[PDB]
Amino acid sequence: NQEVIAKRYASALFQIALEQGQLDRIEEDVRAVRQALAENGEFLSLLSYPKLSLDQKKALIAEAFAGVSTPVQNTLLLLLERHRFGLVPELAEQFLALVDDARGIAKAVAYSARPLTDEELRALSDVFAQKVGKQTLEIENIIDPELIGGVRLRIGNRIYDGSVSGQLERIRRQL
Amino acid sequence: TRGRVIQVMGPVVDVKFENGHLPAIYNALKIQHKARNENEVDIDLTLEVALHLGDDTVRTIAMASTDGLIRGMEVIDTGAPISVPVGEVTLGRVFNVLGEPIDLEGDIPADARRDPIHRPAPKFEELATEVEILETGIKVVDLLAPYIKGGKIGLFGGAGVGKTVLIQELIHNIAQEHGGISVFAGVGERTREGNDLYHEMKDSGVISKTAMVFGQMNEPPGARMRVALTGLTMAEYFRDEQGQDVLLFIDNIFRFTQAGSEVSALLGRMPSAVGYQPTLATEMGQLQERITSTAKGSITSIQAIYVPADDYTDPAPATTFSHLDATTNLERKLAEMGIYPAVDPLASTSRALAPEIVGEEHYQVARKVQQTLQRYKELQDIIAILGMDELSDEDKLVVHRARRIQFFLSQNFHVAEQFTGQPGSYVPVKETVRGFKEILEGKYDHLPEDAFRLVGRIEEVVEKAKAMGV
Amino acid sequence: MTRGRVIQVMGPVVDVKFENGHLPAIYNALKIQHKARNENEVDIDLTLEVALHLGDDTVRTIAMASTDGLIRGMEVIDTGAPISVPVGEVTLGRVFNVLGEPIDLEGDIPADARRDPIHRPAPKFEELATEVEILETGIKVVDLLAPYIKGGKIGLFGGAGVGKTVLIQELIHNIAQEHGGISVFAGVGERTREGNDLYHEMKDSGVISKTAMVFGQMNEPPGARMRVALTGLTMAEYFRDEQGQDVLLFIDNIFRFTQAGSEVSALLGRMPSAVGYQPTLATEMGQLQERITSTAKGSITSIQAIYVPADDYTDPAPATTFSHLDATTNLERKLAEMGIYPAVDPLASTSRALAPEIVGEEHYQVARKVQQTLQRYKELQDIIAILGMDELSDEDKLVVHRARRIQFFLSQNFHVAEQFTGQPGSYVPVKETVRGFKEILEGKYDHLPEDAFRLVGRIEEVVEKAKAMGV
Amino acid sequence: IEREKEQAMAALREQVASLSVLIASKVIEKELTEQDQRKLIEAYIKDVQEV
Amino acid sequence: ISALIKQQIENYESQIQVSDVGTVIQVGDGIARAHGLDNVMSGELVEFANGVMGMALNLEENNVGIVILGPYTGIKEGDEVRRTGRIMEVPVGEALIGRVVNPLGQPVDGLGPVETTETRPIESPAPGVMDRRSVHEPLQTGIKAIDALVPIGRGQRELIIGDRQTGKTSVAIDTIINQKDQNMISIYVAIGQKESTVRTVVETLRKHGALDYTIVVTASASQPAPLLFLAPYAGVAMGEYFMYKGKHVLVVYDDLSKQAAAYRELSLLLRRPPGREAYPGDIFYLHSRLLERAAKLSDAKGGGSLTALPFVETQAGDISAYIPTNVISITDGQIFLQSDLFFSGVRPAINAGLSVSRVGGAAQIKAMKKVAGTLRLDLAAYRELEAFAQFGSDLDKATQAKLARGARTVEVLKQDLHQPIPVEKQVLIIYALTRGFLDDIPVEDVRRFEKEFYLFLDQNGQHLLEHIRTTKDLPNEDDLNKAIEAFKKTFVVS
Amino acid sequence: GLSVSRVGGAAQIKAMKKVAGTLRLDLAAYRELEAFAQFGSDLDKATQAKLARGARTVEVLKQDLHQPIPVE
């Protein structure tokens, strides 16, 4: 039940970033907050400690999260005073999923037997950008020695599988 | 101004619009979707607004089945509640919840006006000052349980007793004597019996005065909610425009409340006592207070009531009964005896059976008929076991006049003319009070036990007894 | 090496978190073995059974022993398999706990033994066998009014202290001595005292070395008491599948299976159901009881004692286990307080066996006429209770007069009840009790007093007791 | 008996068929796929592009 | 074998398999939640990585409530669920006849695969008010108390309700056995039973030759409550396949109360709020969706019908419970079986005073109406006057003659097990009862009189039985009187 | 009538086994026969052998509090 709440928080910050005109700064700040909280897991356990006063926890957030923009810091302090600071990485994931749709870029995970060339991935992105609807498309390539002699792609929640689907389709059609 | 579907939770669908473009409560939403590929189903739904959630999200109630709905489907806002056609166009036509013709006689064009389902009740300034009696022509109804003009009636009857025939001659009598349109609203009760009632509408000729609305057990409970309001807003046109004394038949209003209890658990409400929705008294009253007699016309309503397991203490029969003014209890023991209509005379009560409303003479004659029939339903085991020869020559006079009264409570109907050949009668209140007074005085003790059977007036008793030779 | 931390300890319920992609399937055994690093810790040899999946790669488990001592962060071993119970010829003459470990001080089973998992699906439709032949018990109500089916499921419904453990011990004494096959006793949530007495009676009478005994008695936490019947059942399943042999299952208080499920269901995150029982009250008992079947290979005739809570037969746990049983005997407290033992309700006890093509015409006529006179006497108890025996119309007096004799001649002395009263007990053949109830229904023994029929095997014993009384 | 023959025949068939799959994969690995991987991929995009 | 394999390899075409997927959040108790699945439908077949099917019921904002239609022990957190692209369907056809089948449609009896070509959705709307026709033609059960006093027509749903071991399943199997002469297609839906009980029922149907036209749908107690939930809807979908073709279908729902318990489990595990007895809100809607699909279509819709016999098991005669009063308020009449009558020798235990048939009279043939209209009066008079014969002084000779007629009425209405009686013999034995041809004969000989009278009608006379079979009316009340008196000459009173 | 001891009975000191059985019989007969006692004429057993024994059993089995009796 945390993704639906982080979607609301990230949509509020997203509308602020649209109406302000500083979307790149807010996106860089959200990526910095996500990387800093992924690199350090004890900060949530520190701010969940109840003997620390709320003014002291606001002092820790205002000291640590400095250099980021004003609405990102206001969002972090608002999540602190609403006791919803545990969902800040979920907020970062939802906000980056909002701004990727804002830019028009989509993320995809590719599996192939051999690592493909740099032109073939751009060709696959130029093919699949018309099918998905985005202007720019991203391919993540994994080595994956299980599949043989083909490429399969999971973009969004749709899998375009044609690598080992021939052999499985054959042994399902014969038997 | 056209939004997405977020949740599909059984019959409850959650729809999110744009900011500032929310629909008001009870507005009808539309989903008209064509299948984009083979992985989709063509869908035509109508949703009514029920709640407003947090972030532009609206919980709705579906009128048809929600099977096939995809999250993210486009929802059309109509800007109005469920509009239902009314007028002389609805006479003889069978309708669903959405005011669409179920039967294949045609479709109603878009030029006709359509009254909305949801309407406030008539004010205190507008109602009738004192009670008028809706005169039916039925001797049990006019004598012992008088129907007021604008009130609510409870039919307590099952099948095989003659509920539909009583319904049809109520429609016929109010159509020929008061100029009154009737409206039948079948609320969640046995599609087969609604089909039988419609074919008997067609056979009796009663269909040409009746508008009919059917939403049965098969439909989801939002449909079974809004059926009775569809029939009531069809009746309100004739009342508020034609000034008529309209009948409005709701079969099994218990289904109108239990459909609400089925929806309210999924809408997110805390359960009330006995599992019934918490808003049960208000949802009952917003139906029952639009059934009133104003200064212009009237809407009287005969309403069948199914009591589950004959428990009269659960809250939904209690709140149906608190709106009732009279009951007519249809008994199988009188239908097997040959008494048509099989209205139980002692158990059927009325609020109008009081001498300030019916008069002194009608009240005294009705009370004495109730006293002799109650004294007769104390000797039943004694007659059945110990016999007639042993009772007394004072209580056998009681059972004598009790049988003469009990067979004179039955009529020949106009809608039973096609079955027996007898034309049927409309009996006024003064003549049936005079007839039961003359039987109570003892003027007709020499006439036999029959010739009271299935006659309108007491001159017909004299003519039938002279036709029998006596 | 895929090992996990302990997240939550919620009574008998332990949450375990593994690394992503290495979660165990449902019903796999997990092991906790901790060695108490300092003086503020306790040595732990505890095992866990996977029950649910929670998300955030956390696993919701049920413990088999006490969770007193577990620390958030302990290391949990994944065995990759369900609770494997050692099975074979090794289990004969031995006593086991829920984990298949021997608790009878006679040794330990080596690791080379064959061991089957506790959890397996029920036998299919094409594998079942529906032959109905009568298991003779020597109990007159059981032989006459509800014949036990050889190879079928038998239920003993009773309240507390009504005569149910005594009746299942009488069934052991009459059936299990002369069975010529394997027996399996499974004590699910009964007295540990009764686990010792019954073991020493098996050692005395020699019925051991062909029985296998599993005790998960009422001292055990509920995660054990659920899987006791499944351990004893897979011990029975080895014999009827691999050896094709007739197997007796005696299970005392199979109600404790559903009750031990109900104790854990609140802590598993499940919403409550009718009467506080799990929502899965039907399918948890369907995964157990549809698995106790006879197949084409071998048969299991299971005799199950079933506790009835607060003497309420409409309680959801006894009401949903009537549909599983071929023959039921419903013990009543009203009959136990009259001194009628076995306190079997003669009317409410039914069987699939009681049919003329299965038992015989004359047996069926005598049994249905006994039930007719007892139902007619049951319909008169208001008139007898208020107005008395004085206003019955001289055939109802004859019905009451023969029905008191019938209701007392249904009662019987047991071999087990010799330690209760001193009377040595009796074994009655089926033809003897059919001839006896036929002689009572014909009115042959209307001259004898009605207390001469109490706790008596045969009608020759009725006559000798009645002439010992003075008649 | 007639059902028994038809079920055994399908089962055996499935065992041969299983063997045939395992090898199908092994032999396809065995072939030299520099040419094939570029060819397949180029075809696959084209093939995806059409459907 | 290998030539067909080579031909199908030569006919094989390789394409890219596209699929909408979604990873699982929770696995447990036959219930799964899942992220993804953005374009799924409500009430849709969706399938896991094991091949186990699931039904997507609850579509929340971030997950899908998947209802697992098989063994869930192989499904783990992290597996993907594949969107099949079609609503939950049931394979229907003529190949299901004589087969014990899963509610998913797989063969369970083990006699090979079921070769069906087309399917129907498991959630379909009922025929409307205009789509039907009034029930007018008999569903002859063969039980004389049912076919005389509580009659069942084609297109009617009748609740057969009572305690356990009162005779419900025997009424079902006897009704299915009687449909051999008629054009009726039976469907026996076994819900939550022991599977050896289902095998006993199937073998008693095979012994009496009833598997030539019946379909057994079994959802045993070891199967998950998702499969007990979808068993009556699969049964009525298999029925309405033949109903919308012109055929006549009988669908027996054994223990719909176990469907109510399975749907209660299904809703409590999906974390839906309870109601009274913790049953969810749409339990009446649950039973009404399957009991309004039983109808009799009009002559424009084909004319075919589907009559239903749902069962509800009560607890110690508590007829005022929630699921009994839900199903009583749906069906077109009730058949009350009571253990009080069952152990008093009266079997079938039909309490004909409390039992109602709301179609009744239109269901009977014209002979049975004439004969049973006084049967009901005699039995009602006996039920009313037996109350004063329990104790007390005595009753006079007239109502004692009424009590004697009623005792012989009760002895007529008794049957044996799995012995259905044709209607032309039922009208003759109840004609002999009601016209006074049994007052010469004591109460203890009425069963043997009926057993020998059926044999007498078979070997002598038999022009009366052809008259009742062709004209559906009594043969002019004089040949009947001389035939019954000619048999009463033959009958030897014990 | 309602108070049972299962595992006891094998605990007694072999004198109470000899003595207390007919005490149980006499007290059970008295408690089941006293409810229908004051009606009509008493039988030759119910006059003295059962009721006049059971009254003495009831008077024996009464004690005063805080006065335990040794088993001998």
Ligand SMILES: Nc1ncnc2c1ncn2[C@@H]1O[C@H](COP(=O)(O)OP(=O)(O)OP(=O)(O)O)[C@@H](O)[C@H]1O
């Ligand atoms: N004429 C009859 N009608 C019905 N049952 C009869 C009749 N004659 C004998 N019986 C016996 O009554 C019993 C009824 O069992 P049935 O299979 O009907 O169970 P049920 O009523 O479905 O309830 P349950 O399945 O829970 O026992 C059968 O065992 C059968 O032997």
Ligand SMILES: Nc1ncnc2c1ncn2[C@@H]1O[C@H](COP(=O)(O)OP(=O)(O)O)[C@@H](O)[C@H]1O
């Ligand atoms: N056949 C019998 N004869 C005499 N007493 C009995 C008989 N059966 C049971 N009882 C009494 O009823 C009680 C029932 O206890 P028991 O059957 O051992 O356990 P449960 O609590 O399972 O019923 C016992 O205390 C015993 O004294």
Ligand SMILES: [Mg+2]
């Ligand atoms: Mg016990």
Ligand SMILES: [Mg+2]
């Ligand atoms: Mg049954």
